[PDB]
């Protein structure tokens, strides 16, 4: 069983992300809030990809199903896939 994977996003990673996004000062609970938001978004995206893979009569999620789920959610992605 896989556990302790939610704490994989280290503090320097979020610090570099905030520095790239233009944030010059970070508090304390911002890391936990961003972790929860990313977890919720990943859960929704993975659920959509699982539904698409089950509709396609497959098991391994491919890049085409990921692009389809991203287009259904409302955020297109170019470059990856086709």
């Amino acid at each position: 069983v896989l556990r302790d994977n939610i704490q994989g996003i280290t503090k320097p990673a979020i610090r570099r992300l905030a520095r790239r996004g233009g944030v010059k000062r970070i508090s304390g609970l911002i890391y936990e809030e961003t972790r929860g938001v990313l977890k919720v978004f990943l859960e929704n995206v993975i659920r959509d990809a699982v539904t698409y893979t089950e509709h396609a009569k497959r098991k391994t999620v491919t890049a085409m199903d990921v692009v389809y789920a991203l287009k259904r959610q409302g955020r297109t992605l170019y470059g990856f896939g086709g």
Partner: protein, 105 residues
């Protein structure tokens, strides 16, 4: 003469768009001038995008088209930003537009 590219004065394929429209089941009857119009619009859009990418590459002292140059040309043009608003480009980048308050003062 034999192809539509030598008759319409374009380079994008018209029969491919016509076959895609016929196979996509978008309408009962797909015209013949409508695919030519779509090919011309796509050709103009591709020419404008390639011109912007070449200008960005020349400004960045590069002779090739990288996703960074495309992202810069998209975010710089106001019309391209409105046409492609919620479009995420992988390995593109962001603009380093620092705010007026975020300064050493």
């Amino acid at each position: 003469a034999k192809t539509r590219s030598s008759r319409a004065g374009l380079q994008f394929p018209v029969g491919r768009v016509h076959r895609l429209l016929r196979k996509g089941n978008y309408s009962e009857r797909v015209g013949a001038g409508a695919p030519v119009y779509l090919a011309a619009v796509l050709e103009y859009l591709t020419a404008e995008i390639l011109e912007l990418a070449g200008n960005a590459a020349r400004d960045n002292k590069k002779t090739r088209i990288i996703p960074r140059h495309l992202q810069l040309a998209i975010r710089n043009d106001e019309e391209l930003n409105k046409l492609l608003g919620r479009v995420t480009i992988a390995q593109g980048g962001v603009l380093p537009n620092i705010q007026a308050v975020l300064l050493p003062k």
